Amino acid sequence: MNLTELKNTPVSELITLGENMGLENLARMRKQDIIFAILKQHAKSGEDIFGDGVLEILQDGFGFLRSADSSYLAGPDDIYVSPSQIRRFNLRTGDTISGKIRPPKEGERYFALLKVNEVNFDKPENARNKILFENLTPLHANSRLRMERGNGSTEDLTARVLDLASPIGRGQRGLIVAPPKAGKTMLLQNIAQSIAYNHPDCVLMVLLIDERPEEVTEMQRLVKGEVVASTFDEPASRHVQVAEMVIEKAKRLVEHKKDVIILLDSITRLARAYNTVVPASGKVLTGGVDANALHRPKRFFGAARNVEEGGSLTIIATALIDTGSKMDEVIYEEFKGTGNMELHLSRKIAEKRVFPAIDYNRSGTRKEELLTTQEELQKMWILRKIIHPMGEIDAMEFLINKLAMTKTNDDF
Amino acid sequence: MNLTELKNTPVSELITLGENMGLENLARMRKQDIIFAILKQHAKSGEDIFGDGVLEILQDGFGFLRSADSSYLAGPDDIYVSPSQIRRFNLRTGDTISGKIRPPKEGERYFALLKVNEVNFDKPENARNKILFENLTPLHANSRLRMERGNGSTEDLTARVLDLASPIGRGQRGLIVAPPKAGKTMLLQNIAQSIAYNHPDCVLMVLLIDERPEEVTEMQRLVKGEVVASTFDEPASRHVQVAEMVIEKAKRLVEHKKDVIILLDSITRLARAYNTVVPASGKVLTGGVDANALHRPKRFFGAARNVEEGGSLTIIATALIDTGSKMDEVIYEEFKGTGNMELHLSRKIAEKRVFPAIDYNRSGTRKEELLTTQEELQKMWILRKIIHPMGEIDAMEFLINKLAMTKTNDDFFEMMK
Ligand SMILES: Nc1ncnc2c1ncn2[C@@H]1O[C@H](COP(=O)(O)OP(=O)(O)OP(=O)(O)O)[C@@H](O)[C@H]1O
Ligand SMILES: Nc1ncnc2c1ncn2[C@@H]1O[C@H](COP(=O)(O)OP(=O)(O)OP(=O)(O)O)[C@@H](O)[C@H]1O
């Protein structure tokens, strides 16, 4: 009886397994309520029930264990964490906890944790003690994330143009500037698919803020990583909670010297959600957004960095532009010189169905000298010197007609 | 007899046919009171009286049966539902209930439910836990709702342009951006007429929020579906109640693998009613509207989706723009990237009496690849590539002057490449 195993099984199968235990009011209930009832009926059997989840501490000091399957949504199937446990184990908001859970007594309304088996995929040890705020921050350039999954596929074409224009490194702040209808939704999943095949050691998390539900289901069923999202029919507090949970889990995993990658969608809408949630403090609003509010999402984007001790924390967020709203324009202007990697998309190139729509002249990475080989800098700069006088769309033709012949593996 | 039978009969017949039973002081009273009195006078005859209505459960735990004819308005002619009954039948706020009702007692003012005959057009067998919150959400491009009647009528012309510009699929989030005096009201009824004539299997519901009464009567007398409305002389709580009742009925009907379509008018007015009703707790507000309030209408628009299990839930809402109020501007800005289908109208094209006035260059549907045939995408792309360099006012001329010859099934036989 593993809680996570229940949460990953379809609701249609939950009815058959729950009805076979003597439960009748499961005819039309939510998956969380069904799982809670099934556990409470199986808890009467005195058998060991196992559970796990990502910790989130509330204001009162006890917190709960949110589920990654439910995108860290508050529900009856959550696990209560005692404050004394948080005093026994130095637990912060974001620690993945696994262990045996106990049945609820009279008047508790939530399950509680009996034993702490593992903390962040490791036994309860305090060896990995260096919190992310205390780790030194070198430049992103001490590794390259090559997105080259194959040799002769149409998918790798966009990834090959990405590798040629803006190399990706461990712990880089990626910023994808994209107008509407410019190939931004498939560009993210193309990167995510290439991440899992090329760098399986990296923990890949795709965060979708203020996204349509059908595209959420498309993404979470097509990417082999951890896809978390919050649909537009949810309050901005939900978006803020999901974003902070994801960033805290990433920080805690990086504290274990792991390489974590975050693909954030619509950072502008995340900043809008923050402006909505933050209790307005100063009346100095410009363009509709409170200034101090923008302090909160920046910190999110500020978490991405390379670590001198170990591991990395990579964040690639998409900045929406040409939306017609001055709010998104002000957000993008405030996020101008924050990232060390910028990937620009052109709407005019997407009109003529050239699907790699990267503005090569307006795309690049800072400190790319250490992200590439000594001889790799020369070829990329020579290629950029001849693309500079070219047109905005005529450059992509010149790229594809030469890139679709050979690979980036052994150039010439 | 049947309460519903009375609700659909004119008030003139309620007085003439009801006074013949011995009640003559119901003339100067409301239709709901007239129906209540007629039922109470016909109930003393010991004849089985049947009733039905859409369930609405209150906060206290009991519910009533609102009438679709009265646009789900609270009245004396409603049927009380006991909570204990709700414990036997795990009923939600959208379940349409039909069955035998009992007469009220002296001192009681509402009818009660004796027997539960049908639940959502079916025997009470709710063994499938197909609640909307648990159904999977595929994309809206499984089946296409084509608005091509083939009648070759000027009416079908606007619908033919609609099919050419933005195809409609099962379970789509439609957003009709429309300035004032640009052909919005006529565009909706054209869609509603084409839905009932082409796709009778779909349950069509036309929701009108903050609408004038004469236009409400115009709409409910021209659409072959279920027309529900709440006039502007009613509080915002009424608008919220009507909208939530409609969306819950749609959700419950989708739970039975049915294809439900919702034509919502003035989603901006629904968001305004929500902002009025929502208990402002967030001390922030932009443009006059509270931000947290906007969480409530979005969910309505968020309900529209395709379902992997069965049926669909289609919602096409009209977003008002260029009204001069920053409130509507903020609402439209918050609903910018929410829908997967956008149909824009231009007042300048409508000003020249070319009334379809569709902004072709800024209208379209995402993932339209699965809504059309393999060769239909090519023809649409070729047609859009030649409209792209044209203006707004000159594109509709080129479309209409060429569309009135063929029927959008032969329109792709000339200028082939
Ligand atoms: N690399 C590609 N290869 C093939 N087809 C693509 C590619 N990129 C985009 N497309 C097609 O073009 C469309 C581009 O839209 P996409 O989903 O990429 O994001 P977008 O439309 O820019 O995002 P938004 O919804 O915010 O406008 C897609 O629907 C897809 O069918
Ligand atoms: N399809 C059409 N064909 C011909 N004339 C039309 C059409 N649609 C609208 N009109 C003209 O426009 C006027 C009615 O348009 P409609 O009622 O759709 O405006 P509206 O935008 O809904 O109004 P409001 O801006 O007040 O909501 C009438 O005078 C009618 O002559």
Side-chain angles (χ1 to χ4, degrees), chain B residues 208-220:
Chain B
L208 307 174
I209 300 296
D210 276 322
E211 184 74 303
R212 288 151 287 193
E214 64 278 14
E215 296 198 7
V216 169
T217 61
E218 174 87 45
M219 186 71 62
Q220 68 182 16

Side-chain angles (χ1 to χ4, degrees), chain A residues 28, chain B residues 53-55 90-97 119-120 252:
Chain A
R28 296 167 48 189
Chain B
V54 179
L55 181 61
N90 293 120
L91 292 185
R92 301 180 64 93
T93 313
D95 292 333
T96 302
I97 309 301
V119 175
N120 295 310
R252 300 302 96 85

Side-chain angles (χ1 to χ4, degrees), chain A residues 351-378:
Chain A
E351 301 182 28
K352 279 180 53 184
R353 293 173 263 176
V354 184
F355 280 123
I358 299 185
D359 195 342
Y360 197 98
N361 294 8
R362 302 210 183 89
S363 297
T365 71
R366 293 175 175 81
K367 301 289 180 178
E368 64 181 345
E369 299 82 301
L370 330 172
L371 281 176
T372 62
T373 306
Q374 211 287 329
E375 209 81 356
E376 204 167 86
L377 282 171
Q378 302 181 1

Side-chain angles (χ1 to χ4, degrees), chain B residues 280-384:
Chain B
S281 52
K283 301 176 181 179
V284 298
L285 51 93
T286 295
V289 280
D290 197 326
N292 201 320
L294 291 177
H295 160 246
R296 284 202 144 263
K298 283 185 179 182
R299 194 207 293 184
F300 186 98
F301 201 60
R305 66 185 60 180
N306 197 331
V307 177
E308 188 169 46
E309 290 76 354
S312 62
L313 177 53
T314 307
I315 293 177
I316 299 179
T318 61
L320 296 180
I321 202 57
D322 297 333
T323 326
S325 58
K326 297 183 183 299
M327 181 166 300
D328 303 325
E329 296 178 32
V330 173
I331 293 173
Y332 169 71
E333 209 73 61
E334 289 284 331
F335 275 93
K336 262 296 212 308
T338 56
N340 47 273
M341 175 270 178
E342 295 187 42
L343 200 281
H344 288 243
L345 303 183
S346 294
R347 198 180 73 175
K348 53 193 166 303
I349 312 178
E351 176 253 322
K352 204 190 149 179
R353 204 186 164 183
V354 183
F355 272 119
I358 299 185
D359 195 343
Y360 194 89
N361 295 8
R362 301 213 299 177
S363 297
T365 72
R366 289 176 173 80
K367 301 288 181 178
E368 63 181 345
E369 299 82 301
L370 328 171
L371 281 177
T372 61
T373 81
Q374 263 281 7
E375 209 80 356
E376 203 169 308
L377 282 171
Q378 305 178 2
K379 297 147 169 206
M380 284 185 339
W381 271 345
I382 293 302
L383 191 145
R384 183 170 256 92

Side-chain angles (χ1 to χ4, degrees), chain B residues 4-50:
Chain B
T4 309
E5 288 181 25
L6 285 167
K7 294 195 301 212
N8 291 268
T9 40
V11 56
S12 310
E13 193 174 345
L14 265 60
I15 307 172
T16 304
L17 191 59
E19 191 179 329
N20 289 336
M21 306 176 112
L23 302 178
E24 80 171 56
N25 286 337
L26 48 85
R28 239 190 189 180
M29 295 197 311
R30 290 81 189 273
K31 183 194 289 182
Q32 298 81 5
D33 296 320
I34 295 178
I35 294 172
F36 178 79
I38 290 179
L39 285 184
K40 201 176 72 64
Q41 178 77 344
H42 194 310
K44 66 186 295 296
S45 173
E47 302 190 29
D48 290 358
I49 45 185
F50 296 128

Side-chain angles (χ1 to χ4, degrees), chain A residues 225-241:
Chain A
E226 185 177 53
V227 178
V228 190
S230 59
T231 59
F232 72 99
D233 41 298
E234 297 182 308
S237 59
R238 179 91 189 101
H239 306 295
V240 170
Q241 173 200 1

Side-chain angles (χ1 to χ4, degrees), chain A residues 276-412:
Chain A
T276 290
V277 172
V278 161
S281 179
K283 303 177 182 179
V284 186
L285 50 93
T286 295
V289 280
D290 197 327
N292 250 29
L294 290 177
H295 159 56
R296 287 208 78 173
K298 284 184 179 182
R299 194 207 293 184
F300 184 98
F301 201 61
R305 66 186 60 180
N306 197 330
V307 177
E308 188 170 46
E309 289 77 351
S312 62
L313 177 53
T314 307
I315 293 177
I316 299 179
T318 61
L320 296 180
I321 202 57
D322 297 333
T323 325
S325 57
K326 295 184 182 299
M327 181 167 301
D328 303 325
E329 296 178 32
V330 173
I331 293 173
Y332 169 71
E333 206 73 60
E334 289 285 331
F335 276 94
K336 198 271 177 180
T338 56
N340 48 332
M341 175 270 178
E342 295 186 42
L343 201 283
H344 287 65
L345 303 185
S346 294
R347 198 178 71 176
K348 54 192 71 65
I349 309 180
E351 301 182 28
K352 279 180 53 184
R353 293 173 263 176
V354 184
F355 280 123
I358 299 185
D359 195 342
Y360 197 98
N361 294 8
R362 302 210 183 89
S363 297
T365 71
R366 293 175 175 81
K367 301 289 180 178
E368 64 181 345
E369 299 82 301
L370 330 172
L371 281 176
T372 62
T373 306
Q374 211 287 329
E375 209 81 356
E376 204 167 86
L377 282 171
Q378 302 181 1
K379 49 163 294 185
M380 283 189 340
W381 201 256
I382 292 302
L383 190 145
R384 183 170 255 92
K385 278 188 172 181
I386 67 182
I387 297 297
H388 182 275
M390 296 214 182
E392 195 177 304
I393 180 178
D394 300 335
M396 289 312 304
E397 299 278 335
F398 181 80
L399 280 180
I400 61 177
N401 85 277
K402 284 293 197 293
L403 205 57
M405 306 326 197
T406 325
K407 281 68 54 195
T408 319
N409 228 324
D410 44 6
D411 222 351
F412 325 120

